[PDB]
Amino acid sequence: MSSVSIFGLGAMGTALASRFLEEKYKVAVWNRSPEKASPLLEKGATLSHTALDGINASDLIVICLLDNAAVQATLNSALEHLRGKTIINLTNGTPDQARKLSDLIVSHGAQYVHGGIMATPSMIGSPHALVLYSGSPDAFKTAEADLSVLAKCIFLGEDAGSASLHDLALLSGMYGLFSGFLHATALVRSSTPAVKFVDLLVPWLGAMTEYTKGMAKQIDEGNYASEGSNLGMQLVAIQNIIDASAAQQVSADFIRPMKEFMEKAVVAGHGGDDISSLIDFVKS
Amino acid sequence: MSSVSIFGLGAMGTALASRFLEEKYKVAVWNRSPEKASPLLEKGATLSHTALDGINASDLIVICLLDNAAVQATLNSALEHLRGKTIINLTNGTPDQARKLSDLIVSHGAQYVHGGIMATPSMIGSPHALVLYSGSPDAFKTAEADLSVLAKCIFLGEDAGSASLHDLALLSGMYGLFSGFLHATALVRSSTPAVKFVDLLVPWLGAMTEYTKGMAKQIDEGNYASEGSNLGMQLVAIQNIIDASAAQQVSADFIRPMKEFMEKAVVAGHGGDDISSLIDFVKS
Ligand SMILES: NC(=O)C1=CN([C@@H]2O[C@H](COP(=O)(O)OP(=O)(O)OC[C@H]3O[C@@H](n4cnc5c(N)ncnc54)[C@H](OP(=O)(O)O)[C@@H]3O)[C@@H](O)[C@H]2O)C=CC1
Ligand SMILES: NC(=O)C1=CN([C@@H]2O[C@H](COP(=O)(O)OP(=O)(O)OC[C@H]3O[C@@H](n4cnc5c(N)ncnc54)[C@H](OP(=O)(O)O)[C@@H]3O)[C@@H](O)[C@H]2O)C=CC1
Ligand SMILES: CNC1CCCCC1
Ligand SMILES: CNC1CCCCC1
Ligand SMILES: [Mg+2]
Ligand SMILES: [Mg+2]
């Protein structure tokens, strides 16, 4: 009685398909390279030999492809067969790509929800997974029970591009954290095992992640008066990081953006302010 | 009976001096701009009118100045009066600066410990504060009871530059996290309050901070085989972050280093590997 049709059997699409199968859904699967379907067919999925077969397999279509060019190309042949269906697009893309694809899909008589998967494939089906959704509220509402098999759901509203905006912002936070981890580990690699260093680093990153909640407060209030850690002193520290990196033949490129934004803010009069003040200098 | 002599009454030196006073130490204080001493003198500190007075006030000298040029300049007049003293230098600097200053100080008959304060001034005296120390093991041992008034202590060994290496690496981790927070908040600023967004961001950064412990494992083992999140797919995601940033007139400079390192690794054959593989590409 419960059915879904999946497009994309990469790492993530495979994990989606596997989870629906585990929960005894009727699951159709489609992939450009159809041999990625075999492990799923053995577990009870039906192969969509063509994209149109996948469109006709269910009124709930879940797409998870590399990029939204692949999504458009895959659907293009079948756009006249989308009437009445719900498209859940989990492909990473920009807000604008989701808004334009939403317009196209809605013009063909279907409804569109975009989703940003904040999880790795192994996390699918666990309480640690979260998917951010936006687009059709009606379609999300009627599909929510099915989507909750994959992950916790947060619905962000009717703008089809809001899920990808929030996804890409969360990923940009991640990439900053990973940039810092790689820089830090590279600096100590010749001295300390990385596993030994992360016993220092992880608690420290936790403490600095806590310093962010109040930074968000300062940002929402426009109040950057230093609480003890001024930018002049921080620019010296950053230059010491740059210089120590060079001495060890480690690249300091990860921290040069921060130095440049901090220098701009200091030129503008923030040498005695906190780092939240940089929010006004990250434009352009 | 318990005494200390502090050099530097900036934000951090003031917090050190205040904490020792609270614990009923005899505390001498020195600062280039001596009017920063008044709040401390009112609480029972003695003013060092000259650097030599500060050197002669105690055999435990704690220095906390902007940079190690200020440290050298401050001590230079008094180098012949350091015999028998312990210098605890908490000034941020490079490993080499600490090694050279250590050599100079030891040549003048004193002992030298460098310290990296992993705390803000308000954290001094709390269990959340940590100071990383390296240099003379004997001097650290006999001063440890006094230093523990400020913060938890970790001693890293006899290399006078190890405390600053580990400090600067931890700070580089911090700056990566803060780079990601600023990028993320800048992207959503026009859509969402920052305080609302951090309710998503903080748990997410926690989950990604956990992903780092296994990354350290992969690094120490040289084994980068993907567990589900390949670099080819990540480079697409990063480009989507760059493009979404431009559309919103937000700078994407924070993530360009990561894109460049990831592109280099993919050229070298890691398109199907995990992000830990970048550790070999952050050189130069
Ligand atoms: N950790 C993860 O892996 C996460 C992934 N995501 C997102 O999920 C999506 C899928 O990622 P993931 O499964 O990891 O990526 P993969 O690299 O494992 O798989 C990419 C998928 O896209 C397909 N594809 C690529 N180009 C085309 C094309 N031109 N036409 C049709 N299909 C094509 C591939 O088909 P083929 O098999 O034929 O090559 C494959 O199904 C991405 O948007 C990613 O950002 C989100 C969160 C986490
Ligand atoms: N959150 C923080 O504030 C933290 C700071 N630190 C480190 O602690 C150190 C002190 O930082 P903080 O107190 O915040 O910085 P401040 O900017 O508040 O104070 C800087 C101090 O250095 C002195 N100084 C600067 N140039 C000279 C000079 N040429 N000769 C003599 N003294 C000079 C200033 O004297 P004057 O008052 O006369 O200007 C002042 O005492 C730095 O190395 C920093 O990295 C470590 C961790 C956290
Ligand atoms: C040296 N820079 C400081 C370190 C402690 C946190 C705030 C910034
Ligand atoms: C889209 N890139 C992925 C997101 C989830 C964590 C690993 C990297
Ligand atoms: Mg392509
Ligand atoms: Mg100076």
Side-chain angles (χ1 to χ4, degrees):
Chain A
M1 273 306 72
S2 268
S3 87
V4 63
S5 187
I6 305 299
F7 287 75
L9 297 177
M12 175 65 76
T14 291
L16 306 176
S18 292
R19 179 42 182 200
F20 279 122
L21 281 172
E22 287 180 357
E23 310 296 303
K24 302 286 190 232
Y25 280 60
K26 169 167 154 203
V27 178
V29 297
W30 179 90
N31 197 56
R32 164 175 72 171
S33 309
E35 71 274 20
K36 292 204 221 177
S38 314
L40 293 139
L41 303 188
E42 288 154 25
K43 308 191 306 175
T46 299
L47 174 64
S48 300
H49 290 84
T50 68
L52 175 81
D53 281 321
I55 296 300
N56 287 330
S58 181
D59 284 346
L60 183 62
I61 312 293
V62 173
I63 306 177
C64 191
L65 298 170
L66 178 58
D67 57 16
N68 274 310
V71 172
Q72 183 120 15
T74 297
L75 293 179
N76 175 83
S77 52
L79 290 173
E80 307 182 65
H81 298 73
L82 301 173
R83 207 152 275 291
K85 295 187 182 282
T86 295
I87 305 298
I88 308 298
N89 186 14
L90 301 180
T91 302
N92 182 284
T94 63
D96 191 60
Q97 287 168 348
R99 292 179 190 125
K100 281 165 173 51
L101 187 57
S102 176
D103 284 345
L104 177 60
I105 291 313
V106 157
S107 80
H108 284 287
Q111 311 171 287
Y112 181 90
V113 180
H114 206 92
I117 303 169
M118 295 345 288
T120 61
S122 59
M123 298 175 49
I124 295 304
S126 79
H128 300 272
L130 172 77
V131 183
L132 308 175
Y133 294 99
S134 67
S136 170
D138 320 71
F140 174 77
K141 219 174 316 273
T142 82
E144 188 181 1
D146 300 302
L147 297 174
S148 300
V149 175
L150 304 172
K152 288 166 181 193
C153 307
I154 296 184
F155 186 74
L156 300 174
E158 179 134 27
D159 171 19
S162 177
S164 290
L165 174 68
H166 287 75
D167 175 20
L168 297 183
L170 286 177
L171 295 179
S172 80
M174 199 191 49
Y175 283 118
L177 194 148
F178 289 168
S179 295
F181 164 74
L182 291 169
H183 195 177
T185 301
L187 278 168
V188 305
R189 188 119 196 250
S190 66
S191 302
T192 314
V195 278
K196 198 157 121 72
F197 183 66
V198 87
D199 288 334
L200 285 176
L201 179 67
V202 156
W204 176 243
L205 292 173
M208 282 308 102
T209 290
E210 221 58 28
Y211 180 103
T212 79
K213 311 159 136 289
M215 256 185 296
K217 190 207 181 53
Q218 280 159 105
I219 284 163
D220 273 356
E221 282 169 359
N223 177 20
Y224 301 128
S226 190
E227 328 205 88
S229 303
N230 71 73
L231 292 186
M233 172 275 293
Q234 287 194 62
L235 275 171
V236 171
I238 292 166
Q239 194 64 42
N240 290 332
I241 293 166
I242 290 167
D243 293 348
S245 294
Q248 276 231 45
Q249 296 177 349
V250 167
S251 175
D253 286 355
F254 281 130
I255 206 168
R256 295 198 193 263
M258 176 71 75
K259 176 199 170 173
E260 201 229 33
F261 295 127
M262 205 179 269
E263 284 175 336
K264 269 159 154 134
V266 155
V267 156
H270 295 282
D273 291 343
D274 265 347
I275 199 159
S276 55
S277 66
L278 277 58
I279 194 69
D280 289 330
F281 295 85
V282 302
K283 302 167 217 273
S284 269
Chain B
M1 273 306 72
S2 268
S3 87
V4 63
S5 187
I6 305 299
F7 287 75
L9 297 177
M12 175 65 76
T14 291
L16 306 176
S18 292
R19 179 42 182 200
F20 279 122
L21 281 172
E22 287 180 357
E23 310 296 303
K24 302 286 190 232
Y25 280 60
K26 169 167 154 203
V27 178
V29 297
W30 179 90
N31 197 56
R32 164 175 72 171
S33 309
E35 71 274 20
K36 292 204 221 177
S38 314
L40 293 139
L41 303 188
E42 288 154 25
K43 308 191 306 175
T46 299
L47 174 64
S48 300
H49 290 84
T50 68
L52 175 81
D53 281 321
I55 296 300
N56 287 330
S58 181
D59 284 346
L60 183 62
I61 312 293
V62 173
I63 306 177
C64 191
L65 298 170
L66 178 58
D67 57 16
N68 274 310
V71 172
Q72 183 120 15
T74 297
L75 293 179
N76 175 83
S77 52
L79 290 173
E80 307 182 65
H81 298 73
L82 301 173
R83 207 152 275 291
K85 295 187 182 282
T86 295
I87 305 298
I88 308 298
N89 186 14
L90 301 180
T91 302
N92 182 284
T94 63
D96 191 60
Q97 287 168 348
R99 292 179 190 125
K100 281 165 173 51
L101 187 57
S102 176
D103 284 345
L104 177 60
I105 291 313
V106 157
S107 80
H108 284 287
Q111 311 171 287
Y112 181 90
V113 180
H114 206 92
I117 303 169
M118 295 345 288
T120 61
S122 59
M123 298 175 49
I124 295 304
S126 79
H128 300 272
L130 172 77
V131 183
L132 308 175
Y133 294 99
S134 67
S136 170
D138 320 71
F140 174 77
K141 219 174 316 273
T142 82
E144 188 181 1
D146 300 302
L147 297 174
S148 300
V149 175
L150 304 172
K152 288 166 181 193
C153 307
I154 296 184
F155 186 74
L156 300 174
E158 179 134 27
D159 171 19
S162 177
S164 290
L165 174 68
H166 287 75
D167 175 20
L168 297 183
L170 286 177
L171 295 179
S172 80
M174 199 191 49
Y175 283 118
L177 194 148
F178 289 168
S179 295
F181 164 74
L182 291 169
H183 195 177
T185 301
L187 278 168
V188 305
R189 188 119 196 250
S190 66
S191 302
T192 314
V195 278
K196 198 157 121 72
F197 183 66
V198 87
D199 288 334
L200 285 176
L201 179 67
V202 156
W204 176 243
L205 292 173
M208 282 308 102
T209 290
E210 221 58 28
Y211 180 103
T212 79
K213 311 159 136 289
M215 256 185 296
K217 190 207 181 53
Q218 280 159 105
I219 284 163
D220 273 356
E221 282 169 359
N223 177 20
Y224 301 128
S226 190
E227 328 205 88
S229 303
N230 71 73
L231 292 186
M233 172 275 293
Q234 287 194 62
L235 275 171
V236 171
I238 292 166
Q239 194 64 42
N240 290 332
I241 293 166
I242 290 167
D243 293 348
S245 294
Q248 276 231 45
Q249 296 177 349
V250 167
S251 175
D253 286 355
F254 281 130
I255 206 168
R256 295 198 193 263
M258 176 71 75
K259 176 199 170 173
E260 201 229 33
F261 295 127
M262 205 179 269
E263 284 175 336
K264 269 159 154 134
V266 155
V267 156
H270 295 282
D273 291 343
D274 265 347
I275 199 159
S276 55
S277 66
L278 277 58
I279 194 69
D280 289 330
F281 295 85
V282 302
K283 302 167 217 273
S284 269

PDB file of all heavy atoms in Angstrom, chain B residues 5 27 36 44-45 49 53 58 87 97 104 108 115 123 136 165 168 192 201 221 228 234 251 262:
ATOM      1  N   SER B   5      54.678  38.118  40.158  1.00  0.00           N
ATOM      2  CA  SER B   5      54.928  39.397  39.527  1.00  0.00           C
ATOM      3  C   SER B   5      54.456  39.315  38.092  1.00  0.00           C
ATOM      4  O   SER B   5      54.933  38.463  37.336  1.00  0.00           O
ATOM      5  CB  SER B   5      56.396  39.755  39.574  1.00  0.00           C
ATOM      6  OG  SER B   5      56.552  41.073  39.087  1.00  0.00           O
ATOM      7  N   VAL B  27      50.923  40.295  44.893  1.00  0.00           N
ATOM      8  CA  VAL B  27      50.921  40.431  43.432  1.00  0.00           C
ATOM      9  C   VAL B  27      51.523  41.777  43.067  1.00  0.00           C
ATOM     10  O   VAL B  27      51.041  42.821  43.542  1.00  0.00           O
ATOM     11  CB  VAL B  27      49.485  40.328  42.866  1.00  0.00           C
ATOM     12  CG1 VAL B  27      49.539  40.522  41.369  1.00  0.00           C
ATOM     13  CG2 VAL B  27      48.860  38.989  43.253  1.00  0.00           C
ATOM     14  N   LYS B  36      46.549  51.450  33.640  1.00  0.00           N
ATOM     15  CA  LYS B  36      45.795  50.220  33.659  1.00  0.00           C
ATOM     16  C   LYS B  36      45.981  49.476  34.954  1.00  0.00           C
ATOM     17  O   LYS B  36      45.177  48.602  35.218  1.00  0.00           O
ATOM     18  CB  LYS B  36      46.157  49.408  32.434  1.00  0.00           C
ATOM     19  CG  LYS B  36      45.641  50.100  31.151  1.00  0.00           C
ATOM     20  CD  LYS B  36      45.431  49.147  29.993  1.00  0.00           C
ATOM     21  CE  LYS B  36      45.921  49.753  28.654  1.00  0.00           C
ATOM     22  NZ  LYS B  36      45.752  48.725  27.547  1.00  0.00           N
ATOM     23  N   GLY B  44      44.844  45.618  46.094  1.00  0.00           N
ATOM     24  CA  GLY B  44      45.941  45.161  46.928  1.00  0.00           C
ATOM     25  C   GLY B  44      47.229  44.853  46.169  1.00  0.00           C
ATOM     26  O   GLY B  44      48.217  44.455  46.796  1.00  0.00           O
ATOM     27  N   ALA B  45      47.250  45.043  44.873  1.00  0.00           N
ATOM     28  CA  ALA B  45      48.506  44.836  44.149  1.00  0.00           C
ATOM     29  C   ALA B  45      49.493  45.963  44.434  1.00  0.00           C
ATOM     30  O   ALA B  45      49.129  47.070  44.822  1.00  0.00           O
ATOM     31  CB  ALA B  45      48.280  44.756  42.646  1.00  0.00           C
ATOM     32  N   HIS B  49      57.205  50.138  39.355  1.00  0.00           N
ATOM     33  CA  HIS B  49      57.385  51.394  38.638  1.00  0.00           C
ATOM     34  C   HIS B  49      58.292  51.215  37.442  1.00  0.00           C
ATOM     35  O   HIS B  49      58.273  52.057  36.531  1.00  0.00           O
ATOM     36  CB  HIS B  49      57.945  52.467  39.595  1.00  0.00           C
ATOM     37  CG  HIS B  49      56.918  52.886  40.601  1.00  0.00           C
ATOM     38  ND1 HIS B  49      56.698  52.174  41.758  1.00  0.00           N
ATOM     39  CD2 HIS B  49      56.065  53.929  40.625  1.00  0.00           C
ATOM     40  CE1 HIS B  49      55.676  52.708  42.410  1.00  0.00           C
ATOM     41  NE2 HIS B  49      55.292  53.787  41.758  1.00  0.00           N
ATOM     42  N   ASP B  53      61.944  46.703  38.914  1.00  0.00           N
ATOM     43  CA  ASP B  53      61.165  46.500  40.119  1.00  0.00           C
ATOM     44  C   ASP B  53      60.280  45.256  40.012  1.00  0.00           C
ATOM     45  O   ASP B  53      60.128  44.508  40.991  1.00  0.00           O
ATOM     46  CB  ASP B  53      60.293  47.723  40.397  1.00  0.00           C
ATOM     47  CG  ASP B  53      61.055  48.853  41.022  1.00  0.00           C
ATOM     48  OD1 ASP B  53      61.932  48.605  41.881  1.00  0.00           O
ATOM     49  OD2 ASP B  53      60.698  49.999  40.699  1.00  0.00           O
ATOM     50  N   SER B  58      59.412  39.208  42.815  1.00  0.00           N
ATOM     51  CA  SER B  58      59.072  37.799  43.037  1.00  0.00           C
ATOM     52  C   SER B  58      60.054  36.971  42.236  1.00  0.00           C
ATOM     53  O   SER B  58      60.657  37.464  41.280  1.00  0.00           O
ATOM     54  CB  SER B  58      57.615  37.494  42.630  1.00  0.00           C
ATOM     55  OG  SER B  58      57.273  36.126  42.855  1.00  0.00           O
ATOM     56  N   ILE B  87      60.522  32.332  34.699  1.00  0.00           N
ATOM     57  CA  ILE B  87      59.696  33.124  33.760  1.00  0.00           C
ATOM     58  C   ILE B  87      58.638  32.227  33.142  1.00  0.00           C
ATOM     59  O   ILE B  87      58.993  31.286  32.389  1.00  0.00           O
ATOM     60  CB  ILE B  87      60.563  33.687  32.630  1.00  0.00           C
ATOM     61  CG1 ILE B  87      61.753  34.518  33.155  1.00  0.00           C
ATOM     62  CG2 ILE B  87      59.716  34.392  31.581  1.00  0.00           C
ATOM     63  CD1 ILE B  87      61.426  35.666  33.887  1.00  0.00           C
ATOM     64  N   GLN B  97      59.934  31.788  18.209  1.00  0.00           N
ATOM     65  CA  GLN B  97      60.125  32.908  19.132  1.00  0.00           C
ATOM     66  C   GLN B  97      60.308  32.425  20.554  1.00  0.00           C
ATOM     67  O   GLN B  97      61.148  32.971  21.301  1.00  0.00           O
ATOM     68  CB  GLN B  97      58.925  33.856  19.091  1.00  0.00           C
ATOM     69  CG  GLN B  97      58.870  34.670  17.859  1.00  0.00           C
ATOM     70  CD  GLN B  97      57.571  35.373  17.668  1.00  0.00           C
ATOM     71  OE1 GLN B  97      56.587  35.091  18.367  1.00  0.00           O
ATOM     72  NE2 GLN B  97      57.546  36.306  16.720  1.00  0.00           N
ATOM     73  N   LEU B 104      67.799  32.657  25.433  1.00  0.00           N
ATOM     74  CA  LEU B 104      68.256  33.905  26.015  1.00  0.00           C
ATOM     75  C   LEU B 104      68.066  33.933  27.525  1.00  0.00           C
ATOM     76  O   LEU B 104      68.972  34.312  28.278  1.00  0.00           O
ATOM     77  CB  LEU B 104      67.502  35.059  25.378  1.00  0.00           C
ATOM     78  CG  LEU B 104      67.793  36.437  25.919  1.00  0.00           C
ATOM     79  CD1 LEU B 104      69.275  36.680  25.686  1.00  0.00           C
ATOM     80  CD2 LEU B 104      66.978  37.518  25.257  1.00  0.00           C
ATOM     81  N   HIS B 108      70.904  33.564  30.983  1.00  0.00           N
ATOM     82  CA  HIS B 108      70.978  34.554  32.052  1.00  0.00           C
ATOM     83  C   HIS B 108      70.635  33.954  33.410  1.00  0.00           C
ATOM     84  O   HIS B 108      70.436  34.699  34.372  1.00  0.00           O
ATOM     85  CB  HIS B 108      70.091  35.761  31.721  1.00  0.00           C
ATOM     86  CG  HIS B 108      70.701  36.662  30.698  1.00  0.00           C
ATOM     87  ND1 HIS B 108      71.766  37.491  30.987  1.00  0.00           N
ATOM     88  CD2 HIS B 108      70.488  36.783  29.370  1.00  0.00           C
ATOM     89  CE1 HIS B 108      72.135  38.134  29.898  1.00  0.00           C
ATOM     90  NE2 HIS B 108      71.388  37.712  28.897  1.00  0.00           N
ATOM     91  N   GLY B 115      53.564  29.282  27.903  1.00  0.00           N
ATOM     92  CA  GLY B 115      52.178  28.851  28.099  1.00  0.00           C
ATOM     93  C   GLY B 115      51.267  29.399  27.050  1.00  0.00           C
ATOM     94  O   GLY B 115      51.406  30.565  26.626  1.00  0.00           O
ATOM     95  N   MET B 123      37.119  33.548  31.593  1.00  0.00           N
ATOM     96  CA  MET B 123      37.215  32.113  31.950  1.00  0.00           C
ATOM     97  C   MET B 123      38.337  31.843  32.950  1.00  0.00           C
ATOM     98  O   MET B 123      38.391  30.769  33.584  1.00  0.00           O
ATOM     99  CB  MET B 123      37.414  31.269  30.681  1.00  0.00           C
ATOM    100  CG  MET B 123      36.285  31.281  29.575  1.00  0.00           C
ATOM    101  SD  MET B 123      36.677  30.378  28.062  1.00  0.00           S
ATOM    102  CE  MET B 123      37.254  28.808  28.698  1.00  0.00           C
ATOM    103  N   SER B 136      60.834  24.311  30.750  1.00  0.00           N
ATOM    104  CA  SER B 136      61.564  23.631  31.843  1.00  0.00           C
ATOM    105  C   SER B 136      60.666  22.721  32.671  1.00  0.00           C
ATOM    106  O   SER B 136      59.757  23.219  33.339  1.00  0.00           O
ATOM    107  CB  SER B 136      62.217  24.669  32.727  1.00  0.00           C
ATOM    108  OG  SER B 136      62.732  24.072  33.917  1.00  0.00           O
ATOM    109  N   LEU B 165      53.180  25.883  19.562  1.00  0.00           N
ATOM    110  CA  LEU B 165      52.739  25.105  18.416  1.00  0.00           C
ATOM    111  C   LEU B 165      51.321  24.592  18.626  1.00  0.00           C
ATOM    112  O   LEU B 165      50.457  24.721  17.755  1.00  0.00           O
ATOM    113  CB  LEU B 165      53.670  23.914  18.190  1.00  0.00           C
ATOM    114  CG  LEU B 165      53.177  22.976  17.092  1.00  0.00           C
ATOM    115  CD1 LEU B 165      53.267  23.681  15.787  1.00  0.00           C
ATOM    116  CD2 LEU B 165      54.011  21.675  17.062  1.00  0.00           C
ATOM    117  N   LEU B 168      48.691  27.586  18.679  1.00  0.00           N
ATOM    118  CA  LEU B 168      48.396  28.107  17.348  1.00  0.00           C
ATOM    119  C   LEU B 168      47.615  27.090  16.535  1.00  0.00           C
ATOM    120  O   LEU B 168      46.761  27.459  15.722  1.00  0.00           O
ATOM    121  CB  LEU B 168      49.686  28.454  16.628  1.00  0.00           C
ATOM    122  CG  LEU B 168      50.513  29.549  17.253  1.00  0.00           C
ATOM    123  CD1 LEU B 168      51.689  29.808  16.379  1.00  0.00           C
ATOM    124  CD2 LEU B 168      49.688  30.908  17.435  1.00  0.00           C
ATOM    125  N   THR B 192      16.564  34.931   7.913  1.00  0.00           N
ATOM    126  CA  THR B 192      16.342  34.259   9.189  1.00  0.00           C
ATOM    127  C   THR B 192      17.099  35.073  10.217  1.00  0.00           C
ATOM    128  O   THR B 192      18.216  35.500   9.948  1.00  0.00           O
ATOM    129  CB  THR B 192      16.895  32.811   9.222  1.00  0.00           C
ATOM    130  OG1 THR B 192      16.533  32.087   8.038  1.00  0.00           O
ATOM    131  CG2 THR B 192      16.332  32.091  10.440  1.00  0.00           C
ATOM    132  N   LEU B 201      22.435  25.471  13.389  1.00  0.00           N
ATOM    133  CA  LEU B 201      23.881  25.368  13.172  1.00  0.00           C
ATOM    134  C   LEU B 201      24.614  24.660  14.308  1.00  0.00           C
ATOM    135  O   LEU B 201      25.544  23.895  14.058  1.00  0.00           O
ATOM    136  CB  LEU B 201      24.450  26.778  12.958  1.00  0.00           C
ATOM    137  CG  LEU B 201      25.979  26.814  12.732  1.00  0.00           C
ATOM    138  CD1 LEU B 201      26.324  26.141  11.374  1.00  0.00           C
ATOM    139  CD2 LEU B 201      26.345  28.221  12.639  1.00  0.00           C
ATOM    140  N   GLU B 221      46.364   6.686   9.781  1.00  0.00           N
ATOM    141  CA  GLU B 221      46.501   5.417   9.093  1.00  0.00           C
ATOM    142  C   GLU B 221      46.776   5.537   7.594  1.00  0.00           C
ATOM    143  O   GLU B 221      47.100   4.517   6.965  1.00  0.00           O
ATOM    144  CB  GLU B 221      45.219   4.611   9.338  1.00  0.00           C
ATOM    145  CG  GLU B 221      45.200   3.987  10.726  1.00  0.00           C
ATOM    146  CD  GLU B 221      43.852   3.409  11.096  1.00  0.00           C
ATOM    147  OE1 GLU B 221      42.904   3.505  10.279  1.00  0.00           O
ATOM    148  OE2 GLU B 221      43.726   2.868  12.217  1.00  0.00           O
ATOM    149  N   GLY B 228      31.239   7.153   2.121  1.00  0.00           N
ATOM    150  CA  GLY B 228      29.936   7.590   1.649  1.00  0.00           C
ATOM    151  C   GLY B 228      29.811   9.024   1.151  1.00  0.00           C
ATOM    152  O   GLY B 228      28.694   9.395   0.786  1.00  0.00           O
ATOM    153  N   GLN B 234      31.470  16.447  -3.318  1.00  0.00           N
ATOM    154  CA  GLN B 234      31.675  17.598  -2.443  1.00  0.00           C
ATOM    155  C   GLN B 234      32.110  18.828  -3.209  1.00  0.00           C
ATOM    156  O   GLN B 234      31.742  19.923  -2.847  1.00  0.00           O
ATOM    157  CB  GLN B 234      32.664  17.218  -1.355  1.00  0.00           C
ATOM    158  CG  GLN B 234      32.083  16.300  -0.314  1.00  0.00           C
ATOM    159  CD  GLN B 234      32.981  16.207   0.949  1.00  0.00           C
ATOM    160  OE1 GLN B 234      33.174  17.218   1.599  1.00  0.00           O
ATOM    161  NE2 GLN B 234      33.332  15.037   1.319  1.00  0.00           N
ATOM    162  N   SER B 251      30.464  37.244   0.313  1.00  0.00           N
ATOM    163  CA  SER B 251      31.759  36.771  -0.167  1.00  0.00           C
ATOM    164  C   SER B 251      31.849  35.257   0.041  1.00  0.00           C
ATOM    165  O   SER B 251      31.403  34.734   1.052  1.00  0.00           O
ATOM    166  CB  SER B 251      32.928  37.390   0.614  1.00  0.00           C
ATOM    167  OG  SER B 251      34.188  36.813   0.180  1.00  0.00           O
ATOM    168  N   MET B 262      40.751  20.774  -2.383  1.00  0.00           N
ATOM    169  CA  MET B 262      39.997  19.635  -2.839  1.00  0.00           C
ATOM    170  C   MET B 262      40.230  19.394  -4.331  1.00  0.00           C
ATOM    171  O   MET B 262      40.364  18.253  -4.769  1.00  0.00           O
ATOM    172  CB  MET B 262      38.492  19.810  -2.525  1.00  0.00           C
ATOM    173  CG  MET B 262      37.857  18.374  -2.431  1.00  0.00           C
ATOM    174  SD  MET B 262      36.061  18.614  -2.025  1.00  0.00           S
ATOM    175  CE  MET B 262      35.994  18.591  -0.127  1.00  0.00           C
TER     176      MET B 262
END
